[PDB]
C-alpha cells in the first residue's frame, strides 16, 4: 500500500496501531515498553511524545506476524509462502524529485543529529543507536545498487558509525571504492522510515540479477517511486521520512559499543568506519522509523520468524521431503532449527541436516538441527521434546561435526569463528538403523480432529 503513512493508517483502523500521547524517553524507556508489548503481543507503537523531543518515534511496527502479511498485500500469514514461491522461480523503478522525501534540507554545519530521537536501547550501551536506517551504496565499477540495515551509533555532532559486516555486498561496495579511486571519499545514503514494500525487501536475500528496489517495490502493487539525492548521484527511496547523505573518510574509524545483541549479551568494543553526514533531508511532520534487539524475542526475532516462512518454499523445492522448517526465537532466530520430513529411507535424516547446514547461506551458522517425522509439530516444544526422548539413542543418533564455520561473535565456540555443530536424528528408525521392533505411535483421527473444530467455539472454554 502506497507510502509508509498510507500503510500506517490501515493498522490504526483495525486496532493494529497504538497512539501513546505520554512523554517517553528515547533513552531505554521506549525500548522497555515495546518489549512488554511484543512479549505479550500488543500493537505497533507511535510516540508523538518523545521526552525533550517533538519528532514521532515509531517502533514495534512488524512486532507480530500479522503486521507483516498485511504489509505484503494479504491478511493470511499463509501467502508468505507465495513470497517464497517467488524468489525460487526467479532461478521496475520510477524516479521523482520535489518528491516528499527532500522537502526540508539541512546541510553543512547546520547538521546536528541530536535533533533526532535516536533510541538508547539497553543498560550499558555506548551512545544512542540508529537501528533502522536502510543504507544505500553503489559499486564504482557497475551501476547496480545495494540496500542494508546496519546499526548506526552516533559518536559525534554529525558523525555516524557504519557497522557493516565484511561479507555484505554493501561492505564490498566500499572496499572496491577505495581500491579503484584510492584516498577518495565513498558516497553513502541511508534512508529512514520507509514504506512497507521496500522495507521487507531490505531484510531479504535476492540473487544479484535483480535490483532490490524491483523485488521490494513489486511486493506492493506499485513500481518504486525513487529519487536522486541532493549531495550524490545514488538513489534513495522517495516515500522516505528522513534521508541521510554523506560519505566515509578513508581510514577514519571509531570504537563501537558495548551494545546488547539479540543474542542476549553485550558485544565488546571493536572498531568500525565513520559515515559523516553532510545533509539531513526530511519532510515536516516527518517520522523516524526505529527498533531494538535483546535477549529474544524482539522485533527482528519476530521479523525472523516472519522471514523464515518465506524460506520454506525455497527449501521445499530443493527438499520435497521437508514438511516443515522453523527456527525458534529462543535460539536467537538462527542458531537452532527444527525440520520435519516424510522419511523415505534409512539414513534420510542426515541428508537433511547437511542440506540445512549448507544450502542456504543464512543457515550455515546453525549449531543445532533436530529432524523429526511429519507427525511431530515443529513449532511445539511438547512434540519436539517427545520426539527426541522417545525416538533416539543419544550416542547412536547424534551427528557431531567439528571445525565448521561459526559466528565471529559467538563466544561459546572454541576459537573465534570456528566451532562445531550438532545434528539430532529424532526420526523413527527403520531397520538398518535399529534391530529392535519400534513402537507404534498413537495417531489421532483427522476426522475426530475436524469435527471438534466446528464445535470449539460453540463449546466456549
Q: Report the interface residues with a second copy, using CB under 8 A.
A: 88, 91, 318, 345-348, 350-355, 357-359, 364, 396-397, 399, 401-406, 415-418, 425, 432-433
Cα dist from 344 to 321, 350, 370, 437, whole Å: 8, 12, 17, 18
- Give 297 or 423: the residue with its C-beta nearer to a second copy: 423
Read off the C-alpha cell for 384.
519436539
Q: Is 345 annotated as a binding residue?
A: no
CB of 202 to a second copy, least distance (A): 23
Which residue lies nearer to a second copy by CB, 241 or 397? 397
427 Cβ partners below 8 Å, 6+ apart?
A: 341, 343, 348, 349, 371, 372, 373, 391
Q: Residue 285, preceding bond cis, omega within 30 degrees? A: no
Nearest to 408 by CA among 400, 417, 399: 417
Q: How far is the CB of 334 from a second copy (least distance, A)?
A: 15
- Residue 260's DSSP bridge partners are 266
Long-range contacts of 352-360 (CB under 8 A, 24+ apart): 352/319, 352/321, 352/322, 353/399, 353/423, 353/425, 355/318, 355/319, 356/325, 357/401, 357/404, 357/421, 359/315, 359/318, 359/319, 360/311, 360/314, 360/315
261 is a catalytic site residue: yes
357 carries a ligand binding annotation? no
Residue 146 annotated as binding site: yes
151 is in an annotated binding site: yes
Long-range contacts (CB closer than 8 Å, 24 or more residues apart) made by 69-74: 70/10, 70/11, 70/16, 71/7, 71/196, 71/197, 71/199, 71/200, 72/196, 72/200, 72/219, 73/219, 73/220, 73/221
R_g of the chain computed on alpha carbons: 24
> How far is Cα 318 from Cα 316, in angstroms, rounded to an integer?
5
* Angle at alpha carbon of residue 127, lines to 276 and 131, rounded to 5°: 70
Q: Exposed, middle or buried by CB within 10 Å (0-12, 13-18, 19+), for 293?
A: buried
Ligand-binding annotation for 2, yes or no, is: no
163 among annotated binding-site residues: yes
Handedness of CA 213, 219, 223, 228 (dihedral sign): negative
State the nearest-atom distance from the C-beta of 298 to a second copy, in Å.
27
- Identify which of residues 7 and 357 has a Cβ nearer to a second copy in the complex: 357
Nearest distance in Å: CB 425, a second copy: 7
Spatial CA neighbour of 6 closest among 74, 59, 70: 70
Which grid cell is 116? Answer: 533526532
- Minimum distance from residue 406 beta carbon to a second copy (Å): 7
Annotated ligand binding at 295? The verdict is no
Grid cell at residue 353:
541436516
| Shortest CB 427 distance to a second copy, Å | 11
5 is in an annotated binding site: no
- The answer to the question of whether 169 is labelled as a binding residue is yes
Closest distance to a second copy from the beta carbon of 188 (Å): 25
**Choosing from 261, 298, 407, 425, which is the catalytic residue?**
261
Catalytic residues: 261
Residue ranges for the binding site for Mn(2+)?
Answer: 146, 212
Amino acid at each position: 500500500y502506497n507510502d509508509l503513512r498510507d500503510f500506517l493508517t490501515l493498522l490504526e483502523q483495525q486496532g493494529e496501531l497504538k497512539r501513546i500521547t505520554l512523554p517517553v524517553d528515547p533513552h531505554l524507556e521506549i525500548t522497555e515498553i515495546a518489549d512488554r508489548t511484543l512479549r505479550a503481543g500488543g500493537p505497533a507503537l507511535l510516540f508523538e511524545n518523545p521526552k525533550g523531543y517533538s519528532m514521532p518515534v515509531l517502533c514495534n511496527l512488524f512486532g507480530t506476524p500479522k503486521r507483516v502479511a498485511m504489509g505484503m498485500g494479504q491478511e493470511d500469514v499463509s501467502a508468505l509462502r507465495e513470497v517464497g514461491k517467488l524468489l525460487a522461480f526467479l532461478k521496475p523503478t520510477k524516479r521523482l524529485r520535489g518528491a516528499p522525501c527532500q522537502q526540508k534540507i539541512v546541510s553543512g554545519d547546520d547538521v546536528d543529529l541530536n535533533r533526532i530521537p535516536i533510541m538508547t536501547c539497553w543498560p550499558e550501551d555506548a551512545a544512542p543507536l540508529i537501528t533502522w536506517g536502510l543504507t544505500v551504496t553503489r559499486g564504482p565499477h557497475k551501476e547496480r545498487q545495494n540496500l542494508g540495515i546496519y546499526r548506526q551509533q552516533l559518536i559525534g555532532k554529525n558523525k555516524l558509525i557504519m557497522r557493516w559486516l565484511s561479507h555484505r555486498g554493501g561492505a564490498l561496495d566500499y572496499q572496491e571504492w577505495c581500491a579503484a579511486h584510492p584516498g577518495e571519499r565513498f558516497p553513502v545514503s541511508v534512508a529512514l522510515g520507509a514504506d512497507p514494500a521496500t522495507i521487507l525487501g531490505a531484510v531479504t536475500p535476492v540473487p544479484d540479477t535483480l535490483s532490490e528496489y524491483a523485488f521490494a517495490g513489486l511486493l506492493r502493487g506499485t513500481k518504486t517511486e525513487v529519487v536522486k539525492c541532493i549531495s550524490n548521484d545514488l538513489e534513495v527511496p522517495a516515500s522516505a521520512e528522513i534521508v541521510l547523505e554523506g560519505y566515509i573518510e578513508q581510514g577514519e574509524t571509531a570504537p563501537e559499543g558495548p551494545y546488547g545483541d539479540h543474542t542476549g549479551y553485550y558485544n565488546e568494543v571493536d572498531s568500525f568506519p565513520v559515515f559523516t553526514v553532510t545533509h539531513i533531508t526530511q519532510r515536516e511532520d516527518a517520522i523516524y522509523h526505529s527498533t531494538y534487539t535483546g535477549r529474544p524475542p524482539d522485533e527482528p526475532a519476530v521479523l525472523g520468524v516472519a522471514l523464515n516462512e518465506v524460506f520454506v518454499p525455497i527449501l521445499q523445492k530443493q527438499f520435497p521431503e521437508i514438511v516443515d522448517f522453523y527456527l525458534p526465537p529462543e535460539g536467537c532466530s538462527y542458531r537452532l532449527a527444527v525440520v520435519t520430513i516424510k522419511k523415505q529411507y534409512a539414513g534420510h535424516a542426515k541428508r537433511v541436516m547437511m542440506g540445512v547446514w549448507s544450502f542456504l547461506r543464512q543457515f550455515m551458522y546453525t549449531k543445532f538441527v533436530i529432524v523429526c517425522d511429519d507427525d511431530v509439530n515443529a513449532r511445539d516444544w511438547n512434540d519436539v521434546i517427545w520426539a527426541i526422548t522417545t525416538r533416539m539413542d543419544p550416542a547412536r543418533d547424534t551427528v557431531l561435526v567439528e571445525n565448521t564455520p561459526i559466528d565471529y561473535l559467538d563466544f561459546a565456540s572454541p576459537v573465534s569463528g570456528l566451532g562445531s555443530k550438532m545434528g539430532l536424528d529424532a526420526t523413527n528408525k527403520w531397520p538398518g538403523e535399529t534391530q529392535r521392533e519400534w513402537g507404534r505411535p498413537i495417531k489421532k483421527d483427522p476426522d475426530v480432529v475436524a469435527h471438534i473444530d466446528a464445535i470449539w467455539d460453540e463449546l466456549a472454554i
